[PDB]
A paper describes a structure:
COMPASS is a multi-subunit complex in which the catalytic unit, SET1, is required for H3K4 methylation. An important subunit known to regulate SET1 methyltransferase activity is the CxxC zinc finger protein 1 (Cfp1). Cfp1 binds to COMPASS and is critical to maintain high level of H3K4me3 in cells but the mechanisms underlying its stimulatory activity is poorly understood. Finally, the ability of Cfp1 to associate with SET1A/B and unmethylated CpG islands increases the retention of COMPASS to chromatin.
To confirm this, we solved the crystal structure of Cfp1 RID at 2.3 Å. As defined by the electron density map, Cfp1 RID domain comprises residues 322–508, with one molecule in the asymmetric unit. This region of Cfp1 forms a three α-helix bundle with one Zn2+ atom binding site. The metal binding site is formed by two loops (referred to as L1 and L2). L1 is located at the C-terminus of α1 while L2 is located between α2 and α3. In L1, one metal coordinating residue, C378, is found in the conserved motif XCGΦ (also referred to as motif I) while in L2, C451, H459, C456 are located in the motif CXXXK/RXXCXXHXXW (also referred to as motif II). Comparative analysis reveals that similar to ZC3H, ZC2HC, ZCCHC, THAP, ZMIZ and PARP-Type zinc fingers, CtCfp1 RID domain employs a trio of cysteine residues and the side chain of a histidine to coordinate the zinc ion. However, in stark contrast to ZC3H and THAP, the residues forming the first cluster in CtCfp1 RID ZnF are separated by ∼80 residues; a distance that exceeds all the other zinc binding domain reported to date. Therefore, these observations suggest that the ZnF of Cfp1 RID is a novel type of ZnF. However, mutation of the residues forming both motifs and Tyr380 severely impede the binding of RbBP5 to Cfp1.
Numbering used by the authors: 322 to 404, 443 to 499
Write the structure that this text describes.
Amino acid sequence: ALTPEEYAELTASAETRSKLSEQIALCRQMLQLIELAIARREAAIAAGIPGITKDICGYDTRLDTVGAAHQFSLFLQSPQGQSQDPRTAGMCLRKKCKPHNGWGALLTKTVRHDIRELALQIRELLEAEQRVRDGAAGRF
Ligand SMILES: [Zn+2]
């Protein structure tokens, strides 16, 4: 009981939900990466390496992935979303660091926030899908 154009919308909506779920999966892995960075930071401090004190920043270079993953989450929230020492390698050793100030809690907060936003988007799409099917049943 559906228009050709209603099929096209429902299909694109379901495909968008698919992309949003994959983005949430990516986000959960960013949370693991952040956890891995925190744990590697705690290990370097526990090892008693000269100069590697509790003031050590500890930001891992791979955490820049979190920055671009976050931007892709913002993209998918727009409706145009149709288109050296191994213990410290990669680790930022600045003390009282400010470019990475508070990275552990802030990056955790961003990524967890993106999961909630992406899940909200999925729910809006399920609501809209139910609305289209409601419109076609009313015309039926
Ligand atoms: Zn730093």
